[PDB]
């Protein structure tokens, strides 16, 4: 499939089960630490992924805090459009 993976997560009793990290010298936010047995894993999320959209909005050039706020404000379900940074570049 040529489209980016779209991971559709429903929040569980222990949250979504992943970490989000920025470095800022790098473009945008990255997935880390996808806990075994979590909504994140069931949805197909993988640590190393670069996060491109949250619920249909591009988050590549937003601050870490902005992206976290978007995710937290959503009503307990999020669709994360993600790419493999090794093979994917924003120009
Ligand atoms: Cl982290
Ligand atoms: Cl929405
Ligand atoms: Cl990809
Ligand atoms: Cl890039």
Structural write-up:
Strands 1, 2, 3, 4, 5 and 6 form a 6-stranded antiparallel β-sheet that branches. The protein has a single domain (1-91), classed as PDZ domain (Pdz3 Domain, Roll), CATH 2.30.42.10. It is built from 2 helices and 6 strands. The two termini are 21 Å apart. The protein has helices at 39-42, 64-73, and strands at 5-10, 19-22, 29-32, 50-54, 57-58, 77-83. The longest helix is centred in the last third of the chain and has 10 residues, at 64-73. It is globular. Strand 4 (50-54) and strand 5 form a beta hairpin. By secondary structure, the chain is an alpha+beta fold. Bound molecules: chloride ion (4 copies). One chloride ion binds at residues 19, 21, 32. One chloride ion binds next to loops.
Give the CA-CA distance, first to last residue.
21 Å
Order of helices and strands: EEEHEEHE
The portion of residues assigned to helices is 10-25%
Please name the CATH architecture. Answer: Roll
Number of DSSP strand runs: 6
CATH topology: Pdz3 Domain
Number of helices: 2
The CATH class turns out to be Mainly Beta
Using only CA atoms, what is the Rg?
12 Å
Binned strand content: 25-35%
Main pleated-sheet profile:
6 strands, antiparallel
Protein name: Na(+)/H(+) exchange regulatory cofactor NHE-RF1
Modified residues (Phosphoserine): 38
Domain PDZ: 6-86
Subcellular location: Cytoplasm; Apical cell membrane; Endomembrane system; Cell projection, Filopodium
């Amino acid at each position: 499939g040529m489209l980016p993976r779209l991971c559709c997560l429903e929040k569980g009793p222990n949250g979504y089960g992943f970490h989000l990290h920025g470095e800022k010298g790098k473009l945008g936010q990255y997935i880390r630490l996808v806990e075994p047995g979590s909504p994140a894993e069931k949805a197909g999320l993988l640590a190393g992924d670069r996060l491109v959209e949250v619920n249909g909005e591009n988050v590549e050039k937003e601050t870490h805090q902005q992206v976290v706020s978007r995710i937290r404000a959503a009503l307990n379900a999020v669709r994360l459009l993600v790419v493999d940074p090794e093979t994917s570049t924003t120009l």
